[PDB]
Design a protein around this motif. Structure first.
Motif, PDB file in Angstrom:
ATOM      1  N   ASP A  65      -0.284  -0.169 -13.801  1.00 33.96           N
ATOM      2  CA  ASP A  65      -0.518  -1.588 -13.356  1.00 33.96           C
ATOM      3  C   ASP A  65       0.620  -2.423 -13.883  1.00 33.96           C
ATOM      4  OD1 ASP A  65      -3.349  -0.962 -12.424  1.00 33.96           O
ATOM      5  OD2 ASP A  65      -3.572  -0.513 -14.722  1.00 33.96           O
ATOM      6  N   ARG A  66       1.648  -2.118 -14.427  1.00 33.14           N
ATOM      7  CA  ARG A  66       2.774  -2.590 -14.872  1.00 33.14           C
ATOM      8  C   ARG A  66       3.380  -2.613 -13.332  1.00 33.14           C
ATOM      9  NH1 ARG A  66       3.077  -1.650 -20.303  1.00 33.14           N
ATOM     10  NH2 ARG A  66       3.508   0.439 -20.069  1.00 33.14           N
ATOM     11  N   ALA A  67       3.553  -1.584 -12.687  1.00 32.13           N
ATOM     12  CA  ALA A  67       3.797  -1.386 -11.278  1.00 32.13           C
ATOM     13  C   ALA A  67       3.180  -2.316 -10.412  1.00 32.13           C
ATOM     14  CB  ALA A  67       3.906  -0.030 -10.874  1.00 32.13           C
ATOM     15  N   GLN A 101       0.887  -1.276  -0.117  1.00 33.48           N
ATOM     16  CA  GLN A 101       0.013  -0.032   0.080  1.00 33.48           C
ATOM     17  C   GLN A 101       0.785   1.303   0.133  1.00 33.48           C
ATOM     18  OE1 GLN A 101      -2.730  -0.336   3.383  1.00 33.48           O
ATOM     19  NE2 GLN A 101      -4.038  -1.577   1.929  1.00 33.48           N
ATOM     20  N   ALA A 102       2.170   1.216   0.552  1.00 38.07           N
ATOM     21  CA  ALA A 102       2.949   2.170   0.865  1.00 38.07           C
ATOM     22  C   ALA A 102       3.628   2.662  -0.921  1.00 38.07           C
ATOM     23  CB  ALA A 102       4.060   2.046   1.569  1.00 38.07           C
ATOM     24  N   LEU A 103       3.885   1.305  -1.706  1.00 40.21           N
ATOM     25  CA  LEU A 103       4.508   1.492  -2.811  1.00 40.21           C
ATOM     26  C   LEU A 103       3.299   1.832  -4.108  1.00 40.21           C
ATOM     27  CD1 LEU A 103       7.069  -1.317  -2.609  1.00 40.21           C
ATOM     28  CD2 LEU A 103       7.726   1.043  -2.993  1.00 40.21           C
ATOM     29  N   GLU A 104       2.211   1.464  -3.610  1.00 36.67           N
ATOM     30  CA  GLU A 104       0.831   1.763  -4.651  1.00 36.67           C
ATOM     31  C   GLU A 104       0.764   3.262  -4.520  1.00 36.67           C
ATOM     32  OE1 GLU A 104      -2.200  -0.979  -4.251  1.00 36.67           O
ATOM     33  OE2 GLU A 104      -0.906  -2.508  -4.865  1.00 36.67           O
ATOM     34  N   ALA A 105       0.957   3.842  -3.021  1.00 30.99           N
ATOM     35  CA  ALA A 105       0.294   5.173  -2.829  1.00 30.99           C
ATOM     36  C   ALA A 105       1.197   6.331  -3.633  1.00 30.99           C
ATOM     37  CB  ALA A 105       0.631   5.369  -1.402  1.00 30.99           C
ATOM     38  N   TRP A 106       2.106   5.958  -4.450  1.00 34.17           N
ATOM     39  CA  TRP A 106       2.812   6.965  -5.221  1.00 34.17           C
ATOM     40  C   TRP A 106       3.229   6.549  -6.801  1.00 34.17           C
ATOM     41  CZ3 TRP A 106       4.501  11.117  -2.558  1.00 34.17           C
ATOM     42  CH2 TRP A 106       4.283  11.263  -1.136  1.00 34.17           C
ATOM     43  N   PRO A 107       3.246   7.456  -7.721  1.00 32.14           N
ATOM     44  CA  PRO A 107       3.296   7.195  -8.947  1.00 32.14           C
ATOM     45  C   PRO A 107       4.724   6.604  -9.273  1.00 32.14           C
ATOM     46  CG  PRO A 107       3.531   9.490  -8.724  1.00 32.14           C
ATOM     47  CD  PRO A 107       3.151   8.999  -7.297  1.00 32.14           C
ATOM     48  N   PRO A 108       5.004   5.647 -10.320  1.00 30.41           N
ATOM     49  CA  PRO A 108       5.925   5.049 -10.686  1.00 30.41           C
ATOM     50  C   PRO A 108       6.485   6.152 -11.839  1.00 30.41           C
ATOM     51  CG  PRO A 108       4.158   3.976 -11.920  1.00 30.41           C
ATOM     52  CD  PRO A 108       3.620   4.651 -10.382  1.00 30.41           C
ATOM     53  N   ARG A 166      -7.285  10.098 -25.081  1.00 34.99           N
ATOM     54  CA  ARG A 166      -7.560   8.741 -24.707  1.00 34.99           C
ATOM     55  C   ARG A 166      -6.008   8.052 -24.683  1.00 34.99           C
ATOM     56  NH1 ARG A 166     -11.189   3.871 -26.973  1.00 34.99           N
ATOM     57  NH2 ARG A 166     -10.171   2.242 -25.954  1.00 34.99           N
ATOM     58  N   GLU A 167      -5.185   8.030 -25.550  1.00 36.79           N
ATOM     59  CA  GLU A 167      -4.112   7.521 -25.725  1.00 36.79           C
ATOM     60  C   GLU A 167      -3.042   7.824 -24.536  1.00 36.79           C
ATOM     61  OE1 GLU A 167      -2.200   9.025 -29.174  1.00 36.79           O
ATOM     62  OE2 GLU A 167      -3.469   7.650 -30.650  1.00 36.79           O
ATOM     63  N   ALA A 168      -3.284   9.015 -24.055  1.00 35.52           N
ATOM     64  CA  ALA A 168      -2.678   9.450 -22.863  1.00 35.52           C
ATOM     65  C   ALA A 168      -2.962   8.893 -21.508  1.00 35.52           C
ATOM     66  CB  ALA A 168      -2.622  11.220 -22.875  1.00 35.52           C
ATOM     67  N   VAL A 169      -4.325   8.609 -21.415  1.00 40.31           N
ATOM     68  CA  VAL A 169      -5.176   8.145 -20.442  1.00 40.31           C
ATOM     69  C   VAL A 169      -4.693   6.732 -20.362  1.00 40.31           C
ATOM     70  CG1 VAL A 169      -7.172   7.655 -19.326  1.00 40.31           C
ATOM     71  CG2 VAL A 169      -6.905  10.114 -20.191  1.00 40.31           C
ATOM     72  N   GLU A 170      -4.782   6.140 -21.644  1.00 37.67           N
ATOM     73  CA  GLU A 170      -4.560   4.731 -21.814  1.00 37.67           C
ATOM     74  C   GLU A 170      -3.297   4.099 -21.370  1.00 37.67           C
ATOM     75  OE1 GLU A 170      -2.379   2.785 -24.688  1.00 37.67           O
ATOM     76  OE2 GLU A 170      -3.721   1.795 -24.026  1.00 37.67           O
ATOM     77  N   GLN A 171      -2.203   5.128 -21.587  1.00 40.62           N
ATOM     78  CA  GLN A 171      -0.761   4.727 -21.753  1.00 40.62           C
ATOM     79  C   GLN A 171      -0.407   4.987 -20.019  1.00 40.62           C
ATOM     80  OE1 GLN A 171       1.580   7.021 -24.220  1.00 40.62           O
ATOM     81  NE2 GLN A 171       0.433   6.347 -26.083  1.00 40.62           N
ATOM     82  N   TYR A 172      -1.205   5.952 -19.581  1.00 43.54           N
ATOM     83  CA  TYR A 172      -0.941   6.148 -18.252  1.00 43.54           C
ATOM     84  C   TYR A 172      -1.463   4.851 -17.184  1.00 43.54           C
ATOM     85  CZ  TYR A 172      -1.581   8.429 -13.615  1.00 43.54           C
ATOM     86  OH  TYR A 172      -1.426   8.808 -11.985  1.00 43.54           O
TER      87      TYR A 172
END
Lengths: 64, 122, 122, 64
Positions: D33-35, C22-29, D22-28
Motif C-alpha cells: 500500500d506504499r505502492a 488496475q494494470a499497475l496494481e495487478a503486479w507485485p512491487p 506476522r512481521e512477514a505478513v505485515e511488512q508485505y
C-alpha cells in the motif's frame, strides 16, 4: 612546460629528448595507422549493400 | 580533440562510400558512437550477413552506453531543438562527453553548436 | 512474477485511466520500466508541467538502463519478431531480467512469450 | 531448505514462529500500500491530458 615534463621524464629514462619525441611522435603515428587499417577493411564491408546511409537512418528512426 | 559519429556515416562506410572514409579520418582515434548507433548498424550487418566483421569494426570505437544523466539531457535537448528521441540521445552523448557530433543530417541539426556535417550527396 | 511496464501504460495512468491503475496494481512491487520508457514519459511530464511529480512517481520503479547485452538481445529480437527497435529494447530488457512485459500493443507483440495484454482502447 | 531457516530464527530471535510470520505478513502489506499510494497519487497527475497511451506511444515511437 611540455619541455619541463620532458627533462624530468629524462631524469628517470637516461635518453636524449629527441628519442623522447621519436618515441612520442612514433607511437602517435602508429595509432593513426591502426585507425586507417580498420576503416579500410570496413569499406565497403557490406557486400550487396547499395543503401544510402541517410536514407537508411531515416527508416530506422521510423524503425521499419 | 575527438568526435562522436552518427549512424548514417557508419552506414555509408560499410556501404562502400569514400565520403564516409574521409569523414572518419578527419578526426583522431579513438572515436566514439552511441550504443544506439551500435544497434542501428548491427541491424544492417544482419541484413547483409557481415555481422561478425561489422562487430569487430565497431569495437574500435568508444561505445557509449545510455545512462540516467544522458537520459535527462536527451529529454531537455529534445524539447529545445525539437529533436526526435534517438537524435536527442546521440546529441546528449556528444555534449556530456563534450565531443563534436558528426552527421549528415542538416535538417534537424543545423544551428546546433558542436554539430559538424562533413559531406553531402543526392 | 515480476513486471516490466511498457510506456503506453504509464502514459495511461498519468492521463487518468483507471485501467492503468488496475494494470499497475495487478503486479507485485517493485515493478520495472526501461530507460526508454522513462525518457518518453518525461517528454509528457514536461509538456504538461508535472515534471517533478512524474519524476517522483517514476523513481519508485526499478529503472533498467540499456547496456551492451540488452543491445545484443535487442538486435536479435528485432529480426525474429520484426519489431521496431525501441519495442525490441523494451522486450530485450524484460527477457534478460525475467520480467513479464505488460503492454497494450497487441499488433506488434501477439505470439511473443512473456508478454501480457492487460486492457483495450474502445 | 525453507523452514529450517525459520525454526533457527526461533533460536536467533527467541520469539515464536507465530510471531515471525506476522512481521512477514505485515511488512508485505505495508510494502503493497506504499505502492497503492504511489499509483493512486500518479493517477490523473497530467490532468488536462486527453491523450491516449498507444497513440502517444505510436507517435514518438515512429520518430519523436
Amino acid at each position: 612546460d611540455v619541455i619541463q615534463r620532458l627533462d624530468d621524464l629524462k631524469v628517470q629514462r637516461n635518453i636524449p629528448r629527441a628519442e623522447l619525441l621519436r618515441e612520442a611522435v612514433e607511437q602517435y603515428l602508429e595509432k593513426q595507422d591502426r585507425a586507417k587499417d580498420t576503416i579500410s577493411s570496413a569499406l565497403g564491408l557490406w557486400q550487396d549493400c547499395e543503401e544510402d546511409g541517410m536514407e537508411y537512418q531515416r527508416q530506422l528512426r521510423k524503425e521499419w | 580533440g575527438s568526435a562522436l559519429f552518427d549512424t548514417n556515416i557508419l552506414i555509408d562506410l560499410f556501404s562502400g562510400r569514400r565520403e564516409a572514409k574521409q569523414a572518419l579520418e578527419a578526426w583522431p582515434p579513438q572515436n566514439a558512437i552511441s550504443l544506439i548507433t551500435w544497434m542501428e548498424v548491427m541491424v544492417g550487418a544482419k541484413k547483409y550477413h557481415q555481422e561478425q566483421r561489422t562487430r569487430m569494426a565497431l569495437s574500435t570505437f568508444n561505445i557509449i552506453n545510455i545512462s540516467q544523466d544522458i537520459a535527462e539531457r536527451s529529454v531537455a535537448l529534445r524539447q529545445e531543438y525539437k529533436l526526435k528521441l534517438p537524435d536527442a540521445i546521440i546529441l546528449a552523448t556528444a555534449q556530456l562527453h563534450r565531443l563534436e557530433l558528426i552527421t549528415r543530417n542538416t535538417k534537424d541539426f543545423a544551428g546546433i553548436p558542436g554539430v559538424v556535417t562533413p559531406y553531402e550527396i543526392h
